Amino acid sequence: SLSTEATAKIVSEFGRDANDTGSTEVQVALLTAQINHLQGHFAEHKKDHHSRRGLLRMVSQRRKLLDYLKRKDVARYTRLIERLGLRR
Amino acid sequence: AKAPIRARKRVRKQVSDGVAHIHASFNNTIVTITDRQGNALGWATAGGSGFRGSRKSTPFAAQVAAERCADAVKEYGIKNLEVMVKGPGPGRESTIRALNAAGFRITNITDVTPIPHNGCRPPKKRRV
Amino acid sequence: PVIKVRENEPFDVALRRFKRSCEKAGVLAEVRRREFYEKPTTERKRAKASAVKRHAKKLARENARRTRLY
Amino acid sequence: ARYFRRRKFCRFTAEGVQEIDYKDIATLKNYITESGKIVPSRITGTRAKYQRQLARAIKRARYLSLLPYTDRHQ
Amino acid sequence: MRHYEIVFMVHPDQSEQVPGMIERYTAAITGAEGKIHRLEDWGRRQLAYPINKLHKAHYVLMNVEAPQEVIDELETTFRFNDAVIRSMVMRTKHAVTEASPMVKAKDERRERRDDFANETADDAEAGDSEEEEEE
RNA sequence: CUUGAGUCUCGUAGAGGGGGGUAGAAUUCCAGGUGUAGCGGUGAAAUGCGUAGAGAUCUGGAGGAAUACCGGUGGCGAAGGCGGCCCCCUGGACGAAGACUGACGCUCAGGUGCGAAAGCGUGGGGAGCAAACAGGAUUAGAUACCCUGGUAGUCCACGCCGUAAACGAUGUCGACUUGGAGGUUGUGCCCUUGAGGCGUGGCUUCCGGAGCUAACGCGUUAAGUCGACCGCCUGGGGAGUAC
């Protein structure tokens, strides 16, 4: 679930120029926005365990699709990690 | 307890009407007549009928308790009574019946047997 | 315990059968026993178990005839 | 003839009265005794959706005093 | 936006307070691009059991849509309102803003069975009969 | 590539989590009024409470756990797990069209994260019940049995090793296998004529045919037909302890 206005910003900037939501680069970016919002919540609410299950899903898929993207084009990968400003 | 008394004529306040509260327990019934504005005008009990023990806690012992409370308030000058009932205990009908034999009208037979929103945890009792 | 459901025409005897439909159950029925939080789902909720008895009671009349036991 | 859609006695043998609305007192009293409490959903032959949703809509209605909360209130 | 169906009642003697209060709460809903989709006044009605004492209260079904952010501030203000005795707001899922189950009983109230008295003139001043102070 | 999985906007159903708000009621308690003799407990009973005026009742207040009947074989989570009602934050699941990427997959030593319950450190909170502790009652004698008084505990917040009966009395997930119907839900259609039917999905479950079991039992969600990978067993007692 994401706000409408973010979902279109993500579509303009990420995936292909067809403006899709299915490609590896834009799905990484869609997970990231949901992770990013949640780590802001997860400064407190430290006993909120059924929602954390979800945190761990969104992180686990993000790792996998970035691993996939390095198995695929090295151009697409090197751009993506730098355009989406990921990790620390 | 009650006595085998000669015929009654005595005055207190000539009130004509009252409300009653019948408080039913697991061992007993407590029957208490009050004024309509809320002030105790007299009581009886089923252990005070001297059945004692479990034997105090039956439809017949409850009866004799209601007829008891109903007797003393004739000196209060009551002529009609109405009732509230509050409990699961015995004297289900036989107590309202006793009040009615005292020559009273009893048109409003109000169940108020209280449902707390899951109140205080009970003694566990037997292992079933 | 006259039961709150009102009797047709008021009288000194409460008509305790004709009033009850769903009273005591669950609130004041497990009286003087130790109270649990989530237990009722498995202690009390026995509706499935009781529908099979309602089906067997209505089935057997017809089958007692059909086997020729009647 | 086609598309008559809920004339009378049609969909269910016991009619669904409300779903999740609680502001009319009379739909709610359709399943509420003179003791001031709900009849079981096995007895009524009510459809489960409306009943499951009624468990929220009746607690709501008691809390807005459209209904008696309690036996004491006669 | 998401839909929150609020209904509330107000203590009779204190009903003169709500006609000022309502016009800020509606500006906080339309100022955020929400809508008030009916605003039905029910007249004075008899409570079954008292709420904050007294056996009477004056009924309003407002019927809101507003974004989730704004209704959270506005509900905490209504609950700590001294004029409001209680309110209940129902879930968004599968929620109606048309075709009122009480549509005939609302019209009946207003027409023929109301108070016709000054504390229920105020209730309609917070009702469909809105009279409101300038901002 | 799609045949695996994943993802966007719409709709839907539920007690999933985490934080906020909120009403009325018995016990109980405080204040004032009224009022007399038992009250309480059980198999029956005594301890316990009361004439120094108890018990109960009216009016007002106090206080905290809790919130049903609705609540169903339901539904949600990962096994255990979740129930007043409402809002904020947020997970996970079910349907449907337009549409997309295209094995990005399975399992998992290590691992980080996380509790039914009580245990547990301090703060907040205490109404009721109760291990202990006193005493009664019971009697091969009575710590068990049974009762009365009654504390920590139960309740909230963070924090510490996540304990057991962690389950369809299935390790996981996945692929394949006559179905019908229930419980109950998206949605096209019905005289919208059983919690109903058909069309097309859904979990969840009863029934029974193939196969499987020592027997119960399972049966299309397997405990069938098999598939991969991990965890783990090798007689009892002593020991789920020791090390």
XYZ file of C-alpha atoms (C1' of nucleotides) in Angstrom:
738
model
C 0.000 0.000 0.000
C 1.445 3.384 -1.029
C 0.131 6.839 -1.456
C -0.950 7.433 -5.075
C 1.408 10.427 -5.587
C 4.607 8.474 -4.608
C 3.572 5.501 -6.722
C 3.534 7.786 -9.886
C 6.775 9.584 -8.909
C 8.473 6.041 -8.523
C 6.923 5.057 -12.008
C 8.322 8.200 -13.737
C 11.869 7.706 -12.284
C 12.258 3.952 -12.005
C 11.854 0.770 -14.201
C 11.748 1.214 -17.938
C 10.345 4.172 -19.953
C 7.188 2.064 -20.692
C 6.246 3.344 -17.077
C 5.623 -0.120 -15.627
C 5.417 -1.423 -12.046
C 6.581 -5.033 -12.743
C 10.349 -4.558 -13.598
C 13.111 -5.306 -10.978
C 14.258 -1.715 -10.538
C 10.822 -0.288 -9.812
C 9.767 -3.134 -7.440
C 12.991 -2.554 -5.396
C 11.905 1.176 -5.214
C 8.317 0.214 -4.199
C 9.587 -2.074 -1.350
C 12.083 0.612 -0.251
C 9.332 3.260 0.192
C 7.382 0.731 2.372
C 10.543 -0.200 4.450
C 11.522 3.471 4.877
C 8.093 4.450 6.166
C 8.225 1.422 8.570
C 11.735 1.981 9.996
C 10.349 5.488 10.955
C 7.530 3.642 13.008
C 10.126 1.092 14.327
C 11.962 3.857 16.299
C 9.313 2.955 18.892
C 6.543 0.228 18.943
C 9.286 -2.241 19.781
C 6.772 -5.163 20.727
C 4.888 -4.838 17.291
C 5.706 -8.347 16.086
C 2.963 -9.380 13.523
C 3.800 -6.239 11.462
C 7.614 -6.907 11.695
C 6.970 -10.175 9.834
C 6.181 -7.822 6.948
C 9.357 -5.741 7.441
C 11.394 -8.833 7.009
C 9.514 -9.801 3.789
C 10.018 -6.396 2.154
C 13.880 -6.480 3.160
C 14.309 -10.158 2.005
C 12.798 -9.491 -1.464
C 14.822 -6.226 -1.833
C 18.074 -8.204 -1.230
C 16.939 -10.869 -3.748
C 15.907 -8.582 -6.595
C 19.159 -6.552 -6.210
C 21.065 -9.915 -6.347
C 19.011 -10.722 -9.496
C 19.779 -7.263 -11.009
C 23.602 -7.911 -10.555
C 23.012 -11.397 -12.262
C 21.490 -9.294 -15.132
C 22.745 -6.053 -16.661
C 25.623 -4.450 -14.807
C 24.548 -0.960 -16.264
C 20.935 -1.289 -14.831
C 22.422 -2.399 -11.459
C 25.085 0.390 -11.100
C 22.500 3.073 -11.986
C 19.727 1.649 -9.708
C 21.718 1.448 -6.459
C 22.931 5.059 -6.990
C 19.545 6.526 -8.214
C 17.700 4.963 -5.253
C 20.357 6.026 -2.663
C 20.086 2.636 -0.794
C 21.756 1.539 2.465
C 24.118 3.752 4.443
C -37.730 -13.550 64.652
C -41.651 -13.263 64.283
C -44.240 -13.849 67.114
C -47.855 -15.235 67.229
C -49.344 -11.790 67.865
C -52.936 -10.551 68.560
C -54.726 -8.372 65.888
C -53.032 -5.083 64.844
C -54.212 -1.395 64.893
C -51.088 0.681 65.375
C -49.903 3.872 63.537
C -46.437 5.119 62.383
C -46.872 7.336 59.249
C -49.834 5.805 57.212
C -47.623 5.730 53.996
C -50.158 3.691 51.709
C -47.450 2.568 49.224
C -43.850 1.354 49.101
C -41.175 -0.339 46.659
C -39.527 -3.599 47.644
C -36.120 -5.078 46.877
C -35.565 -8.770 47.069
C -31.903 -9.622 47.346
C -31.322 -13.375 46.416
C -28.067 -15.227 47.401
C -26.813 -18.865 47.015
C -27.500 -19.745 50.763
C -30.426 -17.305 51.510
C -32.934 -14.632 50.489
C -32.938 -11.149 52.140
C -36.420 -9.329 51.705
C -36.457 -5.625 52.559
C -39.457 -3.173 52.130
C -38.658 0.508 51.534
C -40.424 3.820 51.013
C -40.885 4.993 47.358
C -38.364 7.898 48.007
C -35.826 5.312 49.441
C -35.729 4.667 53.130
C -35.940 1.311 54.886
C -39.380 0.576 56.426
C -38.433 -3.027 57.510
C -36.830 -6.449 56.711
C -37.005 -10.175 57.294
C -34.833 -13.186 56.298
C -35.014 -16.981 55.652
C -32.374 -17.884 58.273
C -34.554 -15.733 60.616
C -37.363 -18.204 59.846
C -34.927 -20.506 61.722
C -34.833 -23.284 59.035
C -30.999 -22.685 59.268
C -28.274 -24.264 57.084
C -29.058 -25.226 53.470
C -32.673 -25.720 54.512
C -32.930 -21.802 54.750
C -32.350 -21.680 50.963
C -35.623 -23.144 49.407
C -38.755 -21.589 47.658
C -40.784 -22.239 51.068
C -38.243 -20.535 53.348
C -38.053 -17.567 51.038
C -41.924 -17.478 51.094
C -42.052 -17.267 54.912
C -39.489 -14.547 54.788
C -41.556 -12.316 52.377
C -44.751 -12.897 54.509
C -42.701 -11.849 57.574
C -41.461 -8.496 56.053
C -45.008 -7.931 54.671
C -46.486 -8.449 58.283
C -44.440 -5.813 60.189
C -45.069 -2.938 57.566
C -48.862 -3.068 58.169
C -48.083 -0.792 61.204
C -46.409 1.473 58.567
C -49.895 1.503 56.952
C -48.972 -0.008 53.522
C -51.890 -1.090 51.283
C -50.033 -1.671 47.955
C -46.460 -2.911 47.229
C -44.349 -3.142 44.091
C -41.170 -5.198 43.636
C -37.646 -5.269 42.360
C -35.873 -8.513 42.257
C -31.905 -8.752 42.218
C -30.431 -12.278 42.232
C -30.523 -15.924 40.942
C -31.371 -17.486 44.334
C -34.516 -19.520 45.398
C -37.980 -17.882 46.191
C -38.368 -17.407 42.324
C -42.183 -17.074 42.291
C -42.995 -18.250 45.869
C -41.712 -14.928 47.383
C -43.842 -12.663 44.991
C -46.758 -15.027 45.774
C -46.255 -14.374 49.600
C -46.342 -10.653 49.107
C -49.604 -11.039 47.130
C -51.246 -13.164 49.835
C -50.565 -10.319 52.310
C -53.641 -8.775 50.425
C -51.433 -6.437 48.236
C -51.567 -5.483 44.716
C -48.282 -6.271 42.849
C -48.800 -5.025 39.255
C -44.994 -4.158 38.578
C -42.849 -7.352 39.076
C -39.491 -5.835 37.921
C -36.552 -8.119 37.113
C -33.391 -6.207 37.764
C -31.224 -9.444 38.295
C -27.857 -7.730 37.547
C -25.633 -8.382 34.544
C -22.185 -6.843 35.188
C -20.078 -6.565 32.001
C -18.037 -9.658 33.289
C -17.333 -8.622 36.809
C -15.012 -10.029 39.548
C -13.412 -13.403 39.305
C -15.211 -16.097 41.492
C -13.897 -18.684 44.044
C -12.879 -21.699 41.854
C -14.886 -24.310 43.949
C -14.854 -28.091 42.746
C -12.248 -29.311 40.113
C -14.896 -29.796 37.462
C -34.944 -14.340 38.941
C -38.505 -13.805 37.738
C -36.844 -13.368 34.219
C -37.174 -9.937 32.579
C -39.262 -11.049 29.498
C -42.693 -9.751 30.408
C -45.673 -12.143 31.067
C -49.002 -11.654 29.182
C -51.405 -10.136 31.793
C -49.512 -9.341 35.114
C -49.769 -11.924 38.011
C -48.079 -12.874 41.315
C -46.522 -16.118 39.725
C -43.890 -15.408 37.052
C -44.259 -17.786 34.071
C -40.582 -18.779 34.005
C -40.711 -21.196 30.993
C -42.531 -18.860 28.590
C -40.008 -16.082 29.215
C -36.498 -17.666 28.716
C -34.866 -17.748 25.252
C -31.090 -16.885 25.802
C -30.842 -15.736 29.424
C -28.051 -16.717 32.019
C -26.011 -18.249 29.178
C -22.355 -17.392 29.391
C -22.710 -14.376 31.776
C -24.123 -15.895 35.041
C -24.230 -19.665 34.034
C -20.624 -20.755 35.079
C -21.382 -19.292 38.539
C -18.732 -19.572 41.296
C -15.983 -21.077 39.119
C -12.743 -19.551 37.970
C -13.047 -17.039 35.064
C -10.866 -17.205 31.901
C -10.167 -14.709 29.048
C -10.281 -16.716 25.737
C -11.594 -20.197 27.036
C -15.280 -19.622 26.041
C -14.455 -20.301 22.325
C -13.710 -23.996 23.276
C -15.609 -24.469 26.623
C -19.071 -23.068 25.648
C -19.413 -22.775 21.744
C -20.874 -26.167 21.149
C -23.382 -25.215 18.352
C -21.815 -27.462 15.715
C -21.945 -30.414 18.117
C -25.637 -29.602 18.893
C -26.750 -29.290 15.137
C -25.859 -32.867 14.401
C -28.251 -33.940 17.222
C -30.988 -31.748 15.745
C -30.453 -33.478 12.302
C -30.364 -37.111 13.798
C -33.602 -36.412 15.818
C -35.458 -35.202 12.646
C -33.903 -38.018 10.373
C -34.817 -41.074 12.507
C -38.554 -40.790 12.439
C -38.573 -41.391 8.684
C -35.774 -44.001 8.791
C -37.397 -46.083 11.592
C -40.301 -46.674 9.078
C -37.993 -47.310 6.108
C -35.932 -50.030 7.891
C -39.334 -51.468 8.937
C -38.519 -51.379 12.640
C -41.846 -49.586 13.096
C -39.600 -11.710 -15.230
C -35.904 -10.855 -14.935
C -34.024 -8.636 -12.488
C -36.915 -8.349 -9.806
C -34.011 -8.427 -7.153
C -35.501 -8.707 -3.496
C -39.328 -8.422 -3.892
C -40.264 -10.513 -0.777
C -39.414 -13.992 0.750
C -36.552 -14.257 -1.679
C -32.825 -14.601 -0.992
C -32.892 -16.447 2.400
C -35.900 -17.842 4.375
C -35.022 -15.311 7.176
C -34.481 -11.871 5.829
C -31.241 -9.979 6.454
C -32.165 -6.878 8.558
C -29.338 -4.387 8.391
C -25.733 -5.320 7.632
C -23.530 -3.006 9.679
C -26.014 0.044 10.237
C -27.280 0.701 13.772
C -28.992 4.205 13.742
C -32.590 2.924 13.311
C -33.751 1.354 16.571
C -36.443 -0.928 14.881
C -34.146 -3.110 12.596
C -31.948 -3.639 15.696
C -35.011 -4.607 17.931
C -35.875 -7.273 15.263
C -33.576 -9.714 17.178
C -33.639 -8.186 20.699
C -35.826 -9.797 23.465
C -37.800 -7.892 26.191
C -34.939 -8.867 28.580
C -32.793 -6.487 26.381
C -30.381 -9.002 24.777
C -29.619 -10.740 21.333
C -31.195 -14.103 20.246
C -28.577 -16.711 19.038
C -27.839 -16.830 15.264
C -28.501 -20.630 15.007
C -32.062 -19.933 16.383
C -32.866 -16.884 14.202
C -31.611 -18.444 10.853
C -29.971 -15.173 10.120
C -27.103 -14.958 7.476
C -23.734 -14.888 8.995
C -22.376 -11.635 7.409
C -25.037 -9.357 8.908
C -24.741 -11.088 12.274
C -20.901 -10.952 12.514
C -21.092 -7.220 11.557
C -24.070 -6.771 14.087
C -21.814 -7.804 16.951
C -19.940 -4.358 16.339
C -23.160 -2.432 15.378
C -25.119 -3.461 18.615
C -22.157 -2.646 20.953
C -22.050 0.714 19.156
C -25.930 1.159 19.488
C -25.871 0.312 23.293
C -22.988 2.840 23.684
C -25.151 5.616 21.956
C -28.205 4.681 24.214
C -30.564 3.607 21.323
C -30.970 0.232 23.306
C -30.849 -0.937 26.992
C -27.254 -1.956 27.909
C -28.262 -3.997 30.925
C -31.117 -5.899 32.749
C -31.362 -3.113 35.474
C -32.832 -0.474 33.093
C -36.461 -1.372 33.109
C -10.991 9.550 0.856
C -11.938 7.099 3.600
C -15.499 7.425 5.042
C -16.261 7.673 8.804
C -19.963 7.633 9.727
C -20.266 9.752 12.884
C -23.372 9.945 14.991
C -23.566 11.841 18.315
C -25.767 13.254 21.035
C -25.508 16.406 23.140
C -26.703 17.328 26.601
C -29.941 19.503 26.433
C -29.008 22.523 28.612
C -25.527 22.788 27.006
C -26.896 22.475 23.342
C -26.376 26.312 22.725
C -22.553 25.603 22.706
C -22.487 23.325 19.564
C -23.620 25.913 16.857
C -20.326 27.777 17.198
C -18.138 24.581 17.447
C -19.707 22.852 14.349
C -18.593 25.603 11.913
C -14.915 25.155 12.763
C -15.114 21.325 12.626
C -16.773 21.474 9.006
C -14.026 23.974 7.922
C -11.447 21.565 9.138
C -13.226 18.794 6.998
C -13.817 20.910 3.693
C -10.477 22.819 4.196
C -8.865 19.351 3.729
C -10.993 18.621 0.699
C -13.468 16.237 2.612
C -17.246 16.482 2.407
C -20.275 16.444 4.750
C -22.547 13.978 2.797
C -25.867 14.520 4.684
C -25.861 16.296 8.127
C -29.259 14.930 9.619
C -30.684 16.369 12.814
C -32.888 13.862 14.692
C -34.498 16.258 17.268
C -34.601 15.551 21.078
C -34.924 11.939 22.044
C -35.338 9.962 25.354
C -32.184 8.013 26.429
C -32.892 4.537 27.615
C -30.332 4.693 30.369
C -28.674 8.059 31.345
C -25.198 9.016 29.906
C -23.448 11.686 32.108
C -26.823 11.886 33.935
C -30.240 13.176 32.763
C -32.640 10.950 30.718
C -32.691 13.128 27.528
C -30.281 14.046 24.715
C -30.339 15.820 21.323
C -29.338 13.738 18.263
C -27.096 14.590 15.127
C -25.811 12.287 12.426
C -23.140 14.312 10.535
C -22.020 11.605 7.950
C -18.363 12.574 7.214
C -15.685 11.930 4.748
C -12.214 13.357 5.626
C -8.535 12.192 5.300
C -7.252 10.015 8.124
C -4.933 12.726 9.546
C -7.586 15.354 10.242
C -10.393 13.134 11.792
C -7.897 11.940 14.416
C -7.564 15.518 15.916
C -11.176 16.289 15.459
C -12.414 13.074 17.338
C -10.123 13.656 20.377
C -11.603 17.231 20.529
C -15.142 15.842 20.378
C -14.691 13.228 23.061
C -13.161 15.873 25.454
C -16.084 18.127 24.502
C -18.363 18.892 27.478
C -21.333 19.502 25.153
C -21.059 15.995 23.493
C -22.099 13.179 25.936
C -21.157 10.344 23.546
C -20.364 9.747 19.877
C -19.912 6.642 17.759
C -18.248 6.557 14.296
C -18.320 3.343 12.262
C -15.745 1.570 10.142
C -14.824 2.621 6.596
C -15.247 -0.826 5.061
C -18.259 -1.085 2.822
C -19.791 2.024 4.192
C -22.887 3.883 3.059
C -23.364 7.740 2.543
C -26.827 7.392 0.910
C -30.136 5.374 1.496
C -30.633 5.846 5.255
C -32.162 2.892 7.252
C -33.851 5.703 9.406
C -34.837 7.904 6.492
C -38.648 7.855 7.281
C -38.024 8.033 11.149
C -35.716 11.098 10.728
C -38.530 13.010 8.626
C -41.172 11.980 11.290
C -39.134 13.401 14.110
C -38.578 16.681 12.351
C -42.239 16.985 11.191
C -44.576 16.022 14.026
C -42.866 14.344 17.142
C -40.071 16.939 18.034
C -39.924 19.182 21.124
C -40.753 22.461 19.411
C -38.690 24.146 22.208
C -35.542 26.377 22.545
C -32.865 23.693 23.438
C -33.935 21.704 20.247
C -33.965 24.887 18.193
C -30.170 24.965 19.098
C -29.855 21.260 18.088
C -31.184 22.108 14.534
C -28.796 25.239 14.675
C -26.128 22.521 14.766
C -28.253 20.235 12.516
C -29.549 20.574 8.837
C -31.112 23.986 10.000
C -27.354 25.185 10.496
C -26.964 28.734 11.862
C -23.403 29.660 12.251
C -21.037 32.446 13.447
C -18.764 34.353 10.937
C -15.059 33.278 10.739
C 9.211 -18.534 -22.188
C 5.217 -18.840 -17.974
C 3.985 -22.831 -16.399
C 6.983 -20.571 -10.773
C 7.120 -16.249 -8.118
C 6.814 -11.061 -7.783
C 4.154 -5.948 -8.392
C 0.812 -1.238 -9.488
C -4.178 1.235 -8.962
C -9.869 -0.739 -7.327
C -13.090 -3.665 -4.228
C -13.861 -7.146 0.319
C -13.712 -9.747 5.069
C -11.622 -10.603 10.120
C -11.013 -10.719 18.062
C -3.510 -10.024 13.742
C 0.014 -6.528 15.798
C 1.486 -1.854 18.203
C -0.208 3.433 20.691
C -4.652 6.540 21.858
C -9.833 7.369 23.322
C -14.798 5.652 25.906
C -19.710 3.953 28.582
C -22.547 1.405 32.009
C -23.212 -2.614 35.679
C -22.800 -6.736 40.441
C -18.780 -7.609 44.206
C -16.119 -3.938 46.458
C -15.169 0.730 48.879
C -16.086 6.127 50.931
C -19.621 9.877 52.693
C -24.517 11.060 54.628
C -29.769 9.203 55.533
C -33.316 5.237 56.725
C -33.633 0.577 59.584
C -33.306 -4.591 63.118
C -30.753 -9.738 64.237
C -28.476 -12.546 62.318
C -25.017 -12.482 58.031
C -21.832 -16.221 55.549
C -20.301 -21.054 54.056
C -21.688 -26.583 52.442
C -22.728 -32.724 51.452
C -23.932 -30.911 56.171
C -20.924 -28.000 58.825
C -17.407 -24.967 61.647
C -13.731 -21.239 61.392
C -14.965 -16.203 59.515
C -18.135 -11.270 60.054
C -22.146 -8.864 63.841
C -25.806 -6.092 68.567
C -19.591 -1.583 70.429
C -25.809 -2.016 65.975
C -23.821 -6.207 61.375
C -26.594 -7.960 57.074
C -29.558 -5.130 53.534
C -31.642 -0.349 50.949
C -31.797 5.076 48.825
C -28.849 9.309 46.951
C -24.131 10.921 45.379
C -19.054 9.676 44.830
C -14.660 6.450 44.725
C -11.637 2.728 42.310
C -9.516 -1.204 39.249
C -9.437 -5.987 36.475
C -13.094 -6.693 32.913
C -16.994 -6.298 28.841
C -21.602 -11.542 26.936
C -25.417 -13.408 25.105
C -24.073 -11.365 19.510
C -19.563 -15.519 18.824
C -20.117 -19.792 13.738
C -17.359 -26.491 12.080
C -16.347 -18.573 11.216
C -12.238 -15.413 10.487
C -6.975 -13.309 11.442
C -1.190 -14.942 12.840
C 4.099 -18.029 12.253
C 3.505 -22.996 16.114
C 2.023 -21.654 20.563
C -0.956 -17.191 19.545
C -5.865 -13.252 18.940
C -12.828 -11.299 21.902
C -16.258 -4.430 24.770
C -16.844 -0.586 21.233
C -14.339 3.281 18.510
C -9.771 6.361 16.076
C -4.192 6.708 14.781
C 0.112 3.955 13.075
C 0.694 -0.777 10.303
C 1.083 -6.157 8.764
C -1.066 -10.485 6.377
C -4.981 -12.751 3.509
C -9.362 -13.180 -0.377
C -11.663 -11.368 -5.253
C -11.432 -8.611 -10.353
C -10.046 -5.851 -14.791
C -6.153 -3.184 -17.341
C -0.999 -4.227 -17.207
C 4.068 -5.344 -16.160
C 9.063 -7.771 -15.004
C 10.250 -12.863 -16.513
C 13.160 -19.183 -12.253
C 14.301 -13.055 -9.636
C 12.792 -20.444 -7.557
C 12.826 -24.838 -2.928
C 14.833 -25.915 1.587
C 17.912 -24.149 5.301
C 23.840 -25.158 9.550
C 24.637 -20.210 11.392
C 21.547 -16.282 12.374
C 18.663 -11.708 14.008
C 13.767 -10.654 15.480
C 9.636 -12.021 18.434
C 5.790 -14.992 24.685
C -0.207 -18.725 25.953
C 0.739 -18.484 31.225
C 3.286 -17.429 35.236
C 8.530 -16.379 36.375
C 11.049 -11.501 36.229
C 14.012 -5.619 37.466
C 11.788 -0.629 38.622
C 7.991 2.910 37.811
C 2.562 3.283 37.557
C -2.125 0.467 39.503
C -4.981 -2.755 43.050
C -11.823 -3.846 42.769
C -12.244 -8.909 43.230
C -10.239 -13.766 43.546
C -5.640 -16.672 45.570
C -0.149 -19.865 46.057
C 1.900 -19.053 51.113
C 0.138 -18.090 55.993
C -3.666 -18.666 60.069
C -7.769 -21.398 61.620
C -11.745 -24.480 60.782
C -13.820 -29.034 58.335
C -12.393 -33.994 56.739
C -10.234 -39.000 59.134
C -6.171 -45.629 58.373
C -3.758 -39.818 60.384
C -4.862 -35.456 56.758
C 0.211 -31.337 53.651
C -4.227 -34.011 49.315
C -10.160 -33.818 49.904
C -13.482 -29.293 51.532
C -14.431 -24.249 53.563
C -13.409 -19.473 55.583
C -10.180 -15.338 56.516
C -5.900 -13.470 53.184
C -0.538 -11.447 50.753
C 2.690 -11.331 46.768
C 0.672 -12.542 42.228
C -3.200 -11.387 38.176
C -3.228 -5.170 35.346
C -0.226 -1.577 32.301
C 4.810 0.279 30.132
C 9.812 -0.988 28.731
C 13.253 -4.886 29.503
C 15.689 -10.921 29.943
C 16.855 -16.632 28.514
C 11.116 -17.297 24.287
C 8.732 -22.191 28.369
C 5.036 -26.566 27.862
C 0.350 -30.474 25.467
C 4.722 -25.414 19.482
C -1.458 -29.834 16.964
C -5.843 -32.378 11.767
C -2.470 -36.583 18.496
C 0.200 -33.639 9.724
C 8.547 -30.900 9.608
C 8.549 -27.485 5.697
C 6.943 -25.896 1.267
C 5.853 -27.397 -3.632
C 3.622 -30.514 -7.811
C -0.165 -34.099 -9.015
C -5.321 -37.075 -7.417
C -13.736 -38.999 -8.954
C -16.201 -35.301 -6.134
C -20.586 -33.676 -3.517
C -22.050 -30.704 0.429
C -21.405 -27.624 4.838
C -19.286 -23.269 7.672
C -18.781 -18.827 4.993
C -16.822 -14.975 1.519
C -15.308 -11.796 -3.763
C -18.889 -11.534 -7.733
C -22.215 -12.413 -12.686
C -26.994 -14.123 -12.974
C -32.433 -16.402 -10.394
C -38.992 -16.880 -9.167
C -32.197 -12.164 -6.631
C -37.839 -18.075 -3.130
C -33.225 -23.122 3.289
C -26.457 -19.477 6.751
C -30.440 -21.452 -0.695
C -29.098 -22.510 -6.415
C -26.485 -21.975 -10.813
C -21.621 -19.324 -13.160
C -16.637 -18.467 -11.713
C -12.720 -17.767 -7.783
C -11.961 -18.352 -1.997
C -10.333 -20.152 2.484
C -12.025 -23.435 5.918
C -14.515 -28.157 7.020
C -17.789 -32.617 6.877
C -18.786 -36.918 4.106
C -16.972 -40.859 1.537
C -14.282 -43.654 -3.515
C -8.372 -44.830 -4.869
C -4.002 -45.323 -1.839
C -1.771 -45.570 3.300
C -1.906 -47.185 8.788
C -0.912 -51.889 14.088
C -5.299 -49.060 15.416
C -7.752 -44.767 15.883
C -7.287 -41.822 11.820
C -6.179 -39.260 6.893
C -8.326 -38.610 2.108
C -7.686 -33.840 -3.067
C -5.171 -28.292 2.530
C -2.907 -36.384 3.185
C -1.431 -39.215 7.562
C -2.419 -40.840 -0.927
C 0.984 -40.318 -5.335
C 5.772 -38.269 -4.882
C 9.486 -34.200 -4.895
C 13.690 -31.736 -2.726
C 16.221 -29.778 1.840
C 16.705 -29.390 7.368
C 15.824 -30.764 12.311
C 15.946 -35.632 15.234
C 15.442 -41.139 17.276
C 17.814 -46.210 18.220
C 14.480 -50.526 24.991
C 12.655 -49.275 30.082
C 14.259 -47.252 34.865
C 17.759 -43.620 36.692
C 17.859 -38.694 33.057
C 15.098 -34.296 29.420
C 18.884 -34.486 34.346
C 24.308 -34.641 34.143
C 28.414 -32.583 31.317
